Amino acid sequence: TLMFKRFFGAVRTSWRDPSTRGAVLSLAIIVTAATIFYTLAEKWSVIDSLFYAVSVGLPMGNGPLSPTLTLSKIFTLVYAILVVGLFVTVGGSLASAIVQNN
Amino acid sequence: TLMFKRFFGAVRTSWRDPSTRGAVLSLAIIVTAATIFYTLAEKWSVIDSLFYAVSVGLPMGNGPLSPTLTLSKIFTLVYAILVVGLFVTVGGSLASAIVQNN
Amino acid sequence: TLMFKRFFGAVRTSWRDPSTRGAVLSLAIIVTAATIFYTLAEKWSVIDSLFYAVSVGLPMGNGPLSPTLTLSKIFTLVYAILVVGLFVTVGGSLASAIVQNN
Amino acid sequence: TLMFKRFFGAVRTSWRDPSTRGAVLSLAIIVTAATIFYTLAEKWSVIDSLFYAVSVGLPMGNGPLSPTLTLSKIFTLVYAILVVGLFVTVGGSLASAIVQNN
Ligand SMILES: CCCCCCCCCCO[C@@H]1O[C@H](CO)[C@@H](O[C@H]2O[C@H](CO)[C@@H](O)[C@H](O)[C@H]2O)[C@H](O)[C@H]1O
Ligand SMILES: CCCCCCCCCCO[C@@H]1O[C@H](CO)[C@@H](O[C@H]2O[C@H](CO)[C@@H](O)[C@H](O)[C@H]2O)[C@H](O)[C@H]1O
Ligand SMILES: [Ca+2]
Ligand SMILES: [Ca+2]
Ligand SMILES: [Ca+2]
């Protein structure tokens, strides 16, 4: 029941481009590296890993999932300061492009 | 006694419009779209279903509530990337409107 | 051992004022209301209430506490949208006032 | 495998300085002061104390951890109003800093 959101959302406002939305490329790489780490450090599934990844850089909220090891705990810190920005402007560009599509 | 807040709040300062507080229009569809999905897919009650919809762009904090299913995990990201922006400019506009209200 | 922060922070950086940090006054008033509601509605203690209040507009996070009543649930939803933007500007002005203190 | 984030990130793009990233200095001192507080009050392991301390500036989300003493509740509000904006301006400068590195 989400075909509306996926297609008329975070694939629709992507095909709307300047140059400082090369930040969505940066986010992809910090998000993917994070997902690769949480799967392997923390033993979680990919979807749970991509959930937690995104959860540390948006107001979303981690569910049960949170790190348990020092290595993942620190990584979350290092990652957390780097992604917080790439999310903030991707959310802003993406938000305007909703109101520009109305 | 929530009256003071609902009435001197999300209704009072909601009626200050430029052209760019049609973000509130964009938001209400997106919060609602999310709430239908959460009620139907996640099985939850309207209030709690809305409570999670509003939680993924705001520093409120989602309840015991977190998505348990994959679609509701996937969807929460796609929705969350888009709304986080829509929540912010609205939130600033309303706050802006409280200060020049006294 | 908070006597450091409270004097060298919360009562330090406020003693610096423009026009727009009348925003502190509105946030002050919003939070006190919110706390009274939670103490009265949600039965929680004055700090537990005051903690949740501040929880909902900044990223910090509420540990155990989440509203259990439909009435307090909506109160947080309405109160959430108002307070968040006031949190931004008071939190931003107050942080710049650290930087102009070093 | 955190090395790629640690070195190709939170030190690699940490060392792009204007005048206005003296906040990173200010961050170090206030994040440190909190961690020392959390280690001492909350009994917690320094890492977990540094996990909570950062959790409250960023969209991270504190693990199972939260202030359970009143003073640590009283401290966290005072410190969250101060440190949030510092995590914001550095969050963007480091964000801008990944994009400028393409
Ligand atoms: C006189 C005014 C003329 C300019 C009109 C306005 C166009 C501005 C271009 C901005 O950048 C564009 O956006 C995409 C990304 O930035 C590129 O897409 C694509 O670019 C390549 C084109 O093949 C593909 O390989 C890539 O996958 C994909 O990013 C595209 O090419 C590139 O130009
Ligand atoms: C009337 C005469 C006035 C004198 C002129 C004053 C302004 C000169 C600006 C020179 O630029 C500098 O370049 C460094 C490159 O980033 C900066 O970081 C430097 O400063 C750090 C602080 O010491 C060093 O530790 C680091 O090595 C180093 O990166 C430094 O802050 C910055 O000022
Ligand atoms: Ca959380
Ligand atoms: Ca939230
Ligand atoms: Ca957080």
Residue numbers in the entry:
A (entry chain E), B (entry chain A), C (entry chain B), D (entry chain D): 5 to 106
Paper lines:
To make further progress, we present here a first characterization of a novel tetrameric ion channel, referred to as NaKTs, with an unusual proline-rich selectivity filter sequence using X-ray crystallography, electrophysiology and MD simulations. Single-channel recordings demonstrate that the NaKTs channel is a Ca2+-activated non-selective cation channel. The NaKTs channel belongs to the family of channels with fourfold symmetric tetrameric pore domains. The X-ray structures revealed the presence of Ca2+ binding sites, SCa, formed by main chain atoms of residues Pro63, Gly65, Ser59 and Leu62, near the intracellular end of the selectivity filter.
The crystallographic structure determined at 3.15 Å displays Ca2+ ions bound to the channel tetramer within the selectivity filter. The structural model is complete over all regions, except for residues 1–3 at the N-terminal and residues 107–123 at the C-terminal regions (the latter might have been cleaved by chymotrypsin digestion). In its broad features, the structure of the NaKTs channel is similar to that of other tetrameric pore domains, with a TM helical segment-labelled M1 (residues 21–45), a pore helix (residues 49–62), the selectivity filter (residues Pro63-Met64-Gly65-Asn66-Gly67-Pro68) and a M2 helix (residues 73–101). The channel is in a conformation with an open intracellular gate, with a strong bend of ∼50° near the centre of the M2 helix. While the open conformation of NaKTs is similar to that observed in previous X-ray structures of other channels, the strongest bend in the M2 helix occurs at the level of residue Val87 rather than at the level of a glycine residue proposed to act as a conserved gating hinge in several channels. The narrowest point along the intracellular vestibule occurs at the level of residue Val92, its side chain pointing towards the central channel axis. The diameter is on the order of 10 Å, which is slightly smaller than that observed in other channels in an open conformation, for example, NaK (10.3 Å at Phe92) and MthK (12.9 Å at Ala88). Three different diffraction datasets were analyzed to identify different ion occupancy states (by virtue of the I4 space group symmetry, the six monomers yield three crystallographically related tetramers). A total of nine crystallographically distinct tetramers were considered in the analysis, revealing four different occupancy states, I to IV, with 0, 2, 3 and 6 Ca2+ ions, respectively.
